[PDB]
């Protein structure tokens, strides 16, 4: 029985596409809420756009049914529909009273702990423009945003919608962006992004989930640190190291989870609180999504639907909230594992022990938090003992059902942290020529090159494509330098792309903190700065003076993670790449290029 906080939106939409507005009676939506549609052109890209640079400089990976399949997506109104006709439904049942009580206490203690030192604040339009002028949003039309911010007409709209919220109403926030001319629709998706940043941006801008403030979080830490954090955690005495995943986390978030997240509001006052409340209850709990769909008579239409008690939006606020909730979830599971609560307390908390839960949170919460590494729905926990493996009563009752395992089958962990996966990566200890040890991230090489082969917008803008390829290359040199193929392929890209071109585009995926590779500065210089100078786990600060001195994985670890070394296809590519490099050059044109290759061929380890 809901459709009120949304009425405002559907209206502002109906009176713009009114010349097109209409009801379909063919809407396939029975899970979402159909509100009508309007005629629109079909923007749905045929399928996938390849990065011509990364692609030409990786011929062997042409025929790898693991990097290929990862590229072709369906942006067409047809694909947008097929996808939308598969999404999960298994409406996470609200937790029982006993579970709801423990979660309430836990989340009460957590919010208090996070707010112990820092004070919430509103983020300015200046911070916005600055986070906009760098940081990322999802493509290279990100310059359209850098421009929209300089336009007084975009902020005029923001002023109108901001005033609208201070009274508890939403008009132009729809987290979907599709469609003298007008760019209003764009000024709105972005506007909603600002209003949200202004109201709840402090969580991330002030690092409320950084390890220091959250104890278990890792916000702001790049891959150069995550490895060392895993080691530190995977060393506190106790049971094995557990790293369970929730099956479809986003769909397992309950109204109870949403209520607990919404407790931030109690931390705020006056205008800030009112602005934040409009975000939480208008733009988060009530979603307004747009979707293209092929209608009758070959005409395409934009369907305007909505959902109740939805996840949220603005993947930066989302990340903070997901981290918060997961931290709470793990604390509860630990409580059970330690025998503070059990199967008898699930339905109704027992034998007068609510004070025991508050005592445990009070005296153990902080230490317990330091035994976790939580990044959104991803986590690593080292409990006091292995009773954690069977501590599944509250976990399952919270709808946080583990992925790839029977509901009541105890979890399995490890002893050696050197193999625990975290943030789509397995962190390894690497011994350099000079005896020193690094802790580096590894992950399947097929996914690494597969992602680099992907590019936004039907690449007509070479500069962007080459610049994106360069960020991937330099990202690899910084994080995946130990992988033989990536080091070689990276240097090829850097040799084929003009030296003066600044790397642009998105490389940071899944993870977020990072971006050090987005420079025109020498990569050995930045490698030195992040792996030695600024590495608080690096005792000896003596710099490395050559790439040959920067270690590789063991020939065995390189393959463990998908190396093509030892293969003929890769033998033929490593030896005659200068041709492809030249080909790229000729195509991109007459520019200044530097050769990072030859210096590499000097330390080429081949055929075993």
Q: Which residues are annotated as a binding site?
A: 161, 165, 170, 173, 426, 442, 561
Cβ 14 to Zn ion shortest distance, Å: 17
Give backbone dihedrals phi and psi of 375, rounded to 5 degrees, phi first. -130, 95
Indicate which of Zn ion, Mg ion, none lies near residue 170 (CB less than 5 to 8 Å, by partner kind): Zn ion
Instruction: Choose between 261 and 378: whose C-beta lies nearer to Mg ion.
Output: 378
User: Closer to Mg ion at the Cβ: 121 or 236?
Assistant: 236
* 339: alpha, beta or left? (left if phi > 0; alpha if psi -120 to 50): left
CA-to-CA distance for 563 and 219, rounded, in angstroms? 31
Tell me: does residue 209 bind Zn ion (CB under 5 A). Answer: no
Among Mg ion, Zn ion, none, partner that 464 touches (CB below 5 to 8 angstroms by kind): none
Tell which positions 369-408 bind Mg ion, by CB under 5 A: 378
- The stretch near Zn ion (CB under 5 A) out of 155-163, 213-221, 229-237, 339-347 is 155-163
Sole window of 167-175, 253-261, 371-379, 493-501 interacting with Zn ion (rule: CB under 5 A): 167-175
Task: CB nearer to Zn ion: give 318 or 350.
Answer: 318
Question: 423: alpha, beta or left, given left = phi > 0 and alpha = psi -120 to 50?
Answer: left
Residue 437 CB, nearest approach to Mg ion (Å): 24
* Residue 429 CB coordination number (10 Å): 12
Which of residues 243 and 304 has its CB atom nearest to Mg ion in the complex?
243
User: Whole-number minimum distance, CB 245 to Mg ion, in Å?
Assistant: 5
Compute the least distance from the CB of residue 376 to Mg ion, in Å: 10
Q: How far is the CB of 494 from Mg ion (least distance, A)?
A: 33
Given 243, 279, 289, 511, the residue binding Mg ion (CB under 5 A): 243
Q: CB under 5 to 8 A by kind: which of Zn ion, Mg ion, none does 243 bind?
A: Mg ion
CA nearest to 457, candidates 52, 31, 50, 57: 50
Query: How far apart, in Å, are the Cα atoms of 466 and each of 275, 363, 475, 503?
Result: 41, 54, 14, 8
Residues contributing to the annotated binding site for Zn(2+): 161, 165, 170, 173, 426, 442, 561
**Is residue 357 a contact residue for Mg ion (CB under 5 A)?**
no
36 contacts 304 by C-beta, under 8 angstroms: yes
> Per CB under 5 A, does 170 bind Zn ion?
yes
Minimum distance between the CB of residue 33 and Zn ion, rounded to whole angstroms? 18
**Count of H-run helices and E-run strands, the chain:** 24, 7
* Beta carbon of residue 127, minimum distance to Zn ion (angstroms, whole number): 19
CB of 111 to Zn ion, least distance (A): 25
Q: Are strands 378-381 and 437-442 parallel, antiparallel or unpaired?
A: unpaired
**Angle ∠(491,496,497) on CA atoms, nearest 5:** 100
Nearer to Mg ion, 12 or 402 (CB): 402
532 near 538, Cβ under 8 Å? yes
Size of the site for Mg ion (CB under 5 A): 3
Nearer CB in complex with Zn ion: 194/547: 194
Write the DSSP symbol of residue 544.
Answer: P
CA within 13 Å, CB half, 24: 23
In the bound state with Mg ion, the residue whose beta carbon lies nearer, of 51 and 375, is: 375
Query: 233 or 243, CB closer to Mg ion?
Result: 243
Q: Which is nearer to Mg ion, 335 or 381 (CB)?
A: 381
Do 97 and 104 meet the contact criterion of CB atoms below 8 Å apart? no
Sheet holding 33-39, edge to edge: 33-39, 300-308, 286-294
The partner in contact with residue 264, picked from Mg ion, Zn ion, none with C-beta cut-offs of 5 to 8 angstroms by kind, is none
- Per-residue interface string for the shown chain with Mg ion, residues 187-226, x marking contact by CB under 5 A: ----------------------------------------
* Residue whose structure tokens are 């399952």: 396
In this structure, what are the phi and psi dihedrals at residue 566, rounded to the nearest 5 degrees? 100, -5
Range 462-473 burial, b when 16+ CB lie within 10 A, else e: eebbbbbbbbbb
Q: Residue 96 in contact with residue 346, Cβ under 8 Å?
A: yes
Judged by beta carbon distances under 5 to 8 A according to partner kind, the member of Zn ion, Mg ion, none in contact with residue 485 is none
Longest dimension (CA), the chain: 79
Residue with smallest beta-carbon separation from Mg ion: 243
Applying CB under 5 A, which of residues 173, 291, 340, 600 lies at the interface with Zn ion? 173
The smaller minimum CB distance to Mg ion, of residues 6 and 243, is found at 243
Least distance from Mg ion to the Cβ atom of residue 378, Å:
5
Instruction: State yes or no: residue 6 binds Zn ion (CB under 5 A).
Output: no
Please report how close the Cβ of residue 332 comes to Mg ion at its closest, in angstroms. Answer: 17
Distance between CA atoms of 386 and 55, rounded to whole angstroms?
Answer: 47
Structure tokens at 434: 């000079």
Contact 132, 150 (CB under 8 A): no
With b for 16 or more beta-carbon neighbours within 10 A and e for fewer, the 30-41 pattern comes to eebbbbbbbebe
Question: What backbone phi and psi angles, to 5 degrees, belong to 353?
Answer: -135, 25
The residues binding Mg ion (CB under 5 A) are: 243, 245, 378
Q: Which residues bind Zn ion (CB under 5 A)?
A: 161, 170, 173
């Amino acid at each position: 029985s809901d459709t009120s906080k949304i009425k405002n939106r559907i209206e502002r939409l109906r009176r713009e596409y009114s010349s097109t507005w209409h009801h379909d009676e063919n809407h396939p939506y029975r899970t979402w809420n159909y509100h009508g549609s309007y005629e629109v052109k079909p923007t749905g890209s045929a399928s996938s756009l390849v990065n011509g640079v990364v692609r030409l400089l990786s011929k062997p990976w042409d025929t790898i049914t693991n990097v290929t399949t990862m590229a072709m997506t369906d942006t067409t109104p047809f694909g947008q529909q097929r996808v939308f006709k598969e999404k999960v439904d298994t409406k996470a049942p609200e937790p029982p009273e006993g579970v709801k009580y423990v979660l309430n206490e836990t989340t009460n203690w957590l919010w208090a702990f996070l707010a112990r030192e820092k004070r919430p604040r509103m983020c300015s339009r200046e911070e916005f423009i600055r986070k906009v002028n760098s940081n990322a949003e999802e493509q290279n039309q990100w310059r359209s945003a850098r421009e929209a911010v300089e336009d007084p007409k975009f902020w005029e709209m923001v002023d109108e919608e901001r005033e609208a919220h201070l009274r508890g109403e939403c008009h132009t926030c729809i987290y979907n962006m599709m469609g003298k001319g007008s760019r209003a629709i764009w000024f709105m998706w972005l506007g909603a992004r600002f209003l949200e940043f202004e109201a709840l941006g402090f969580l991330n801008e002030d690092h409320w989930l950084g390890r220091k403030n959250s104890g278990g979080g890792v916000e702001g830490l790049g891959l150069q640190k995550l490895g060392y954090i895993l080691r530190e955690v995977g060393t506190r005495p106790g049971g094995r190291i557990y790293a369970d995943d929730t099956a479809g986390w986003d769909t397992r978030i309950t109204r109870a989870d949403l209520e607990n997240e919404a407790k931030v509001l109690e931390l705020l006052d006056g205008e800030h609180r009112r602005l934040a409340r409009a975000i939480i209850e208008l733009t988060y709990r009530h979603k307004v999504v747009k979707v293209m769909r092929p209608a009758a008579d070959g005409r395409t239409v934009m369907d305007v639907i909505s959902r109740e008690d939805q996840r949220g939006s603005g993947q930066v606020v989302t990340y903070a909230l997901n981290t918060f909730t997961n931290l709470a979830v793990q604390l509860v599971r630990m409580m059970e594992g330690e025998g503070v609560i059990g199967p008898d307390d699930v339905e109704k908390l027992t034998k007068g022990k609510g004070p025991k839960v508050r005592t445990w949170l009070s005296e153990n919460g902080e230490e317990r938090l330091s035994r976790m590494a939580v990044s959104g729905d991803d986590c690593v926990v080292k409990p006091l003992d292995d009773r954690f493996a069977t501590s599944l009563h509250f976990l399952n009752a919270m709808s946080k059902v583990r992925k790839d395992i029977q509901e009541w089958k105890p979890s399995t962990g490890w002893y050696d942290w050197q193999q625990v996966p975290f943030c789509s990566n397995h962190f390894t200890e690497l011994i350099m020529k000079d005896g020193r040890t690094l802790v580096t991230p590894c992950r399947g090489q097929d996914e690494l090159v597969g992602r680099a082969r992907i590019s936004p917008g039907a690449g007509w803008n070479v500069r962007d494509t080459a610049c994106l390829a360069k960020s991937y290359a330099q990202m690899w040199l910084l994080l995946y330098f130990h992988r033989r193929d990536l080091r070689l392929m990276a240097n090829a890209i850097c040799s084929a792309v003009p030296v003066n071109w600044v790397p642009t585009g998105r490389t940071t995926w899944s993870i977020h903190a990072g971006g050090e590779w987005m420079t025109t500065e020498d990569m050995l210089e930045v490698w030195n700065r992040v792996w030695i100078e600024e590495n608080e786990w690096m005792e000896d600060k003596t710099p490395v003076e050559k790439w040959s001195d920067v270690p590789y994985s063991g020939k065995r670890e390189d393959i463990w993670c998908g190396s093509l070394i030892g293969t003929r296809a890769r033998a033929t590519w490593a030896e005659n790449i200068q041709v492809a490099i030249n080909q790229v050059r000729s195509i991109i044109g007459d520019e200044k290029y530097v050769d990072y290759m030859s210096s590499l061929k000097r330390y080429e380890d081949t055929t075993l």
